[PDB]
Amino acid sequence: GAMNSSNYAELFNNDIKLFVDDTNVYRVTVHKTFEGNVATKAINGCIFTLNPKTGHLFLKIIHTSVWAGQKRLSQLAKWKTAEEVSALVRSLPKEEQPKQIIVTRKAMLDPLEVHMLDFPNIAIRPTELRLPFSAAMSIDKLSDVVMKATEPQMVLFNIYDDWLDRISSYTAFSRLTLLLRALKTNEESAKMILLSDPTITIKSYHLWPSFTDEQWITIESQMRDLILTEYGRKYNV
Amino acid sequence: MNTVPFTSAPIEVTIGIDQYSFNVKENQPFHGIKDIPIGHVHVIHFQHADNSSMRYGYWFDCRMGNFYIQYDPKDGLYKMMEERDGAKFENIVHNFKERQMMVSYPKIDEDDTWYNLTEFVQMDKIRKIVRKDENQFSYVDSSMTTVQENELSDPAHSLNYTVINFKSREAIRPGHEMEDFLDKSYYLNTVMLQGIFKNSSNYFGELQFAFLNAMFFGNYGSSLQWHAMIELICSSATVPKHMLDKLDEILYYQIKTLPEQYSDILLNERVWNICLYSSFQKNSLHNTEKIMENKYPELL
Numbered sequence: 219g220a221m222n223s224s225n226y227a228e229l230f231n232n233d234i235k236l237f238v239d240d241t242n243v244y245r246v247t248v249h250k251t252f253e254g255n256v257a258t259k260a261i262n263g264c265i266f267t268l269n270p271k272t273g274h275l276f277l278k279i280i281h282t283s284v285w286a287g288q289k290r291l292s293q294l295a296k297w298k299t300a301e302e303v304s305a306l307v308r309s310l311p312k313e314e315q316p317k318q319i320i321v322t323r324k325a326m327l328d329p330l331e332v333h334m335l336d337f338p339n340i341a342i343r344p345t346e347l348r349l350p351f352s353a354a355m356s357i358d359k360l361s362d363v364v365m366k367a368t369e370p371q372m373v374l375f376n377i378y379d380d381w382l383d384r385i386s387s388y389t390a391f392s393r394l395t396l397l398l399r400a401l402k403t404n405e406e407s408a409k410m411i412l413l414s415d416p417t418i419t420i421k422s423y424h425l426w427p428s429f430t431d432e433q434w435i436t437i438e439s440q441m442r443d444l445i446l447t448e449y450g451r452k453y454n455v
Numbered sequence: 456m457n458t459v460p461f462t463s464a465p466i467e468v469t470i471g472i473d474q475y476s477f478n479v480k481e482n483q484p485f486h487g488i489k490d491i492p493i494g495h496v497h498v499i500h501f502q503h504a505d506n507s508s509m510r511y512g513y514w515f516d517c518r519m520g521n522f523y524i525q526y527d528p529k530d531g532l533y534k535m536m537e538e539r540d541g542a543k544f545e546n547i548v549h550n551f552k553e554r555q556m557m558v559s560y561p562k563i564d565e566d567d568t569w570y571n572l573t574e575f576v577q578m579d580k581i582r583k584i585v586r587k588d589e590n591q592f593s594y595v596d597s598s599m600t601t602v603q604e605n606e607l608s609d610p611a612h613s614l615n616y617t618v619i620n621f622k623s624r625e626a627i628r629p630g631h632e633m634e635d636f637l638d639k640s641y642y643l644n645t646v647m648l649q650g651i652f653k654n655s656s657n658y659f660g661e662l663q664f665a666f667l668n669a670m671f672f673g674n675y676g677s678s679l680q681w682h683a684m685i686e687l688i689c690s691s692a693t694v695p696k697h698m699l700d701k702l703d704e705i706l707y708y709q710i711k712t713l714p715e716q717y718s719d720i721l722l723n724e725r726v727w728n729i730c731l732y733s734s735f736q737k738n739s740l741h742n743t744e745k746i747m748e749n750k751y752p753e754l755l
């Protein structure tokens with residue numbers, strides 16, 4: 219059934235699973251036309267498909283050409299997402315295919331279920347967690363690859379960098395969601411926190427800076443400060 | 456006009472014949488139903504006074520044989536039986552008519568309700584849904600489950616309605632996932648009509664039989680089948696005009712006849728709101744929409 223705080227450790231057991239987030243698939247800018255009407259212009263998007271135990275991110279880039287001549291794009295985007303996830307599963311060896319796929323929005327359930335009818339043994343599940351994966355386009359290297367794409371493309375990342383050498387996947391996922399929640403709250407403050415120290419760099423093969431363990435504790439504390447300070451200004455608490 | 460004689464009525468029971476019904480008291484001198492119109496299927500059904508659950512009954516067509524009902528005190532129900540001795544049957548029906556021990560099927564001459572509810576229903580198709588081939592009549596009750604309910608437990612006592620499942624490989628063509636899920640015309644016209652039912656008459660016959668099983672016995676699985684067959688049409692962008700017009704008439708008379716007291720357990724709010732106000736056919740069921748909005752505006 220649904221995924222929530224009661225069954226949170228299930229994410230880090232040894233059953234292969236993937237989160238699918240579709241919130242950055244269909245992206246637009248809204249603008250005025252010369253006649254003073256309003257129109258949209260699509261920009262490149264991405265499907266965020268993440269193995270929370272290993273950190274493996276299957277970033278399918280959605281090039282704006284996929285929308286050409288199509289109607290009802292917000293509806294199509296859900297079915298295009300489900301088509302690409304289904305294609306990903308079919309491309310994997312049987313022993314690498316997921317046993318469950320968790321969608322971050324309930325509107326993805328029927329499109330993915332229908333695309334996965336050939337896989338009756340893969341559970342398609344919703345979640346009650348409010349996960350901040352929409353903020354993935356605030357990670358500069360991910361945004362860069364999406365905006366530079368001239369054609370459909372899949373790019374593979376590890377969103378945990380090398381963290382699992384030193385911490386568990388529960389801790390790594392907790393760090394990731396804290397970082398993304400912060401970026402979603404105040405992107406500028408969050409990024410200022412992450413980079414303020416010029417001697418801590420992001421390796422070419424990494425997404426985040428090379429913090430020591432002691433430095434991550436400080437960073438995580440500062441991200442918690444930034445989120446609960448804003449929760450209080452926002453709700454006068 | 457045909458007759459269903461009764462040996463006796465040893466236990467108090469409400470007896471239904473099609474859309475009519477009457478109370479018989481314990482050991483009352485009741486010996487059956489006469490003047491039953493020829494040309495239609497019929498259903499004779501029963502609820503004991505002492506049974507909260509278990510309305511049961513028999514679908515039959517008097518052109519296919521001579522049938523009588525007699526109480527079985529071991530199995531505790533009114534049983535339908537077939538009489539092969541036509542002389543014995545003729546003899547009994549006449550003695551009963553002479554002593555005036557039978558109720559008359561009470562059809563008003565203006566009244567096409569039963570025809571309109573059974574237009575496409577044929578005994579041969581009933582007997583394929585209800586499998587018991589040594590009898591020419593078919594027993595149904597409130598508890599019987601459908602083949603699809605058994606997939607989600609006795610196969611001999613099941614209702615073998617056509618399985619309809621909108622999230623199934625039968626309903627969805629590879630590479631047309633969104634198209635076929637949002638517009639079920641392929642599933643309706645190719646898979647079901649051309650493939651399984653062969654024509655819309657057979658489809659409507661199963662739809663009408665499911666509704667009647669659902670209304671007369673409170674058979675849950677039949678209710679599910681009725682709504683699924685409606686939803687499959689309403690969710691199809693491409694339906695023959697004659698099918699939509701006939702569907703509107705079929706549903707009008709079902710809603711018209713529907714017992715107001717049981718409307719809340721017989722009508723699925725989601726299906727009816729989708730069909731009348733969202734679906735491709737939201738503007739094609741004028742008669743049905745008008746009677747629904749005037750009789751059950753709560754549901755909507």
Ligand SMILES: CCC[C@H]1C(=N)N(C)C(=O)N(C)C1=O
Nearest residue numbers: 460461462523538543544547
């Ligand atoms: C001879 C005893 C059975 C019996 C009966 N009691 N009734 C009512 C009937 O109509 N038939 C045809 C019958 O066979």
Ligand SMILES: CCC[C@H]1C(=N)N(C)C(=O)N(C)C1=O
Nearest residue numbers: 669670671672673714717720
């Ligand atoms: C779905 C409703 C079935 C049903 C019933 N349960 N009862 C008790 C009844 O008197 N009638 C007339 C019925 O049709």
Ligand SMILES: CCC[C@H]1C(=N)N(C)C(=O)N(C)C1=O
Nearest residue numbers: 669670673674675678720721
């Ligand atoms: C005509 C069906 C009435 C009915 C029923 N008899 N049962 C068992 C059920 O679970 N529901 C939800 C119903 O609506």
